[PDB]
Each structure stands twice: as structure tokens, then as C-alpha cells.
């Protein structure tokens, strides 16, 4: 007999992507090699972010791309997301960028290549910098989805600003007893 519990004995991570497309799995076959035979911890983060889900790879937009590139120090540096560099239309000027992503929106490709930057993908990033030397890794807003507004401390409860699941927003749809001091009680 051994006095240990087995509740968390199985760690819960991914070790392969749940996707079944072959180009992503060739990227995985490349970065498995580049993560265990380099001492760069960039390749482990790229390998771990290739496994992740669509909701764990949120799209990073172009006006946040350029904004996080306009910080000092990180000039003429390539810059890497693992998700999708979408266009942002509420920005007019666009500097030249060295972007490296899995899939870039066609309008964002036109926007970047018009400004004169270049768009690598990951098999080109491996040839350009195997240890990831001189990169800026970025990621989209992971709490950007609307389902992280329904989460947390429940409504009908003091100091909990949670959007409740309501079938149609109006004045008749959950405004009346929990929501008012006049009728019932306020939270």
C-alpha cells in the first residue's frame, strides 16, 4: 500500500494538435525537432501554440500588430503570431512589418505588402532563424471572445457584473425583480 492520491496523477496537456490537416502537422513535425534539439525556449512556445485550439489562438489584428511594434527597442525585428493576422480597418497608416503567421487575411496581406513589408510563414521562419533569434512573439486577446462575459461570478448576486443568458434583449427580459430597488431587491 502507498499513501498517495491519484486525482491529479494524469497531467492534462496536449501533446499533438486535435486538428487533422496535414500542413499544420508538418509544421508540428518541424518544431518537434527544433524544440528538442535547440536550447531556445522560443521553439517550445511555438510548439505549444501549434497544438492549441481555435479559441486558444485568437486572431491578432493589424492595428495591435503595429501598436505592439511601435514600442521602443523592437525595431527591424520580425514578429510572430501563431493565429491569424486579420486586418483592422480603423487604422490608416501602416509601417513596414516582418510578420510571420499561420494564415493572414487577404486584405491584411494586401495592406502589408502595399506598405512594403514581407510575410513569412513558419517553414520560412525556421530557415530564417532556427533558434528564433531576433523575433517578437505576440498573441491575440484570449479573453476577447464574448463567452468570457458570461463567466465568473453569477448574476443576481452583489458586485457581479456578468452578462446573463437572455433570449432577446429588451425592457421585458430580465429587468424587473432582481434588477431594481423598487421591485424586489437590487444587486
Amino acid at each position: 500500500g502507498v499513501d498517495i492520491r491519484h486525482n491529479k496523477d494524469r497531467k492534462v496537456r496536449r501533446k499533438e494538435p486535435k486538428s487533422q490537416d496535414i500542413y499544420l502537422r508538418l509544421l508540428v513535425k518541424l518544431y518537434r525537432f527544433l524544440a528538442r534539439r535547440t536550447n531556445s525556449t522560443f521553439n517550445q512556445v511555438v510548439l505549444k501554440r501549434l497544438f492549441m485550439s481555435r479559441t486558444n489562438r485568437p486572431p491578432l489584428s493589424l492595428s495591435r500588430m503595429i501598436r505592439k511594434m511601435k514600442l521602443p527597442g523592437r525595431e527591424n525585428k520580425t514578429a510572430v503570431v501563431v493565429g491569424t493576422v486579420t486586418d483592422d480597418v480603423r487604422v490608416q497608416e501602416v509601417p513596414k512589418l516582418k510578420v510571420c503567421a499561420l494564415r493572414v487575411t487577404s486584405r491584411a496581406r494586401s495592406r502589408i505588402l502595399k506598405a512594403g513589408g514581407k510575410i513569412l510563414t513558419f517553414d520560412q521562419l525556421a530557415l530564417d532563424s532556427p533558434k528564433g533569434r531576433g523575433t517578437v512573439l505576440l498573441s491575440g486577446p484570449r479573453k476577447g471572445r464574448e463567452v468570457y462575459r458570461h463567466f465568473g461570478k453569477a448574476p443576481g448576486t452583489p458586485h457581479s457584473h456578468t452578462k446573463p443568458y437572455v433570449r432577446s434583449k429588451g425592457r421585458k427580459f430580465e429587468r424587473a425583480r432582481g434588477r431594481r430597488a423598487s421591485r424586489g431587491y437590487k444587486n
Binding site: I22, Y23, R25, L26, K29
Partner: protein
């Protein structure tokens, strides 16, 4: 390329057969006849195949050239070796080694040619 069409062929090919907890592959230019990446003959640019001859005796050796990849009729060149068992194997060894032609299959082709010639010398 090669690694995409391997990941297409690897579970979906008509040459693959799977029974009795053993996996095989029946493409004509396969050495050791097993489903793997090194041995599959349809995929690569350069490929060695060993077949018994159209005659009862002799070993034909199949070499995939580099130019007509998309051209199947003018892609594979045949050469027939109807000789003694030692010089047949030295011919196949010189063709694979000294031409730098896909050197991982260098011993598997010699094993296969040695297994063909044993079947062609008469039954006990």
C-alpha cells in the same frame, strides 16, 4: 512535395493492406514491402525497385530518374541482370552506393535481390 503526399498516402492508399496486426504496402517499387516513409516508392524523386524478370531467371532493377516526375512512362528505367548471384549483388551495390542514389535502400535491395535469386535457383 514528398512529406505532404506521404501524409495523404499513409492511411488512405489502395496499396495499403492491414490485417493480423501487421501493416503492409503493395506498390511495385517497394523494398521490404512495408508501409513506411523510407520504403514507399511512389513518393520520392529517387527510388530503387527490385523485381524478378519477365523471364524466369534474372533480376530487373528499377531506377526513378530525376526529370520526368509528372511523366510516368518515361520516369522509371529498367535494367536486367541475368548473372551469377555475387555479381548481381555487386552490381546493385555499385548502382546504389556509387551513384549516390538513395543510399538508405542500399542494403534492403541487396536483401531483396538475394531473396529473388534464391527462389529462382531450383527447388529442393
Amino acid at each position: 512535395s514528398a512529406h505532404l503526399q506521404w501524409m495523404v498516402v499513409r492511411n488512405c492508399s489502395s496499396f495499403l493492406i492491414k490485417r493480423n496486426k501487421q501493416t503492409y504496402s503493395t506498390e511495385p517499387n517497394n523494398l521490404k514491402a512495408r508501409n513506411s516513409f523510407r520504403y514507399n516508392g511512389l513518393i520520392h524523386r529517387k527510388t530503387v525497385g527490385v523485381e524478378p524478370a519477365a523471364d524466369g531467371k534474372g533480376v530487373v532493377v528499377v531506377m526513378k530518374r530525376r526529370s520526368g516526375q509528372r511523366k510516368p512512362a518515361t520516369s522509371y528505367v529498367r535494367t536486367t541482370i541475368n548473372k551469377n548471384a555475387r555479381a548481381t549483388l555487386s552490381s546493385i551495390r555499385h548502382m546504389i552506393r556509387k551513384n549516390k542514389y538513395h543510399p538508405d535502400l542500399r542494403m534492403a535491395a541487396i536483401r531483396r535481390a538475394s531473396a529473388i535469386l534464391r527462389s529462382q535457383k531450383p527447388v529442393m
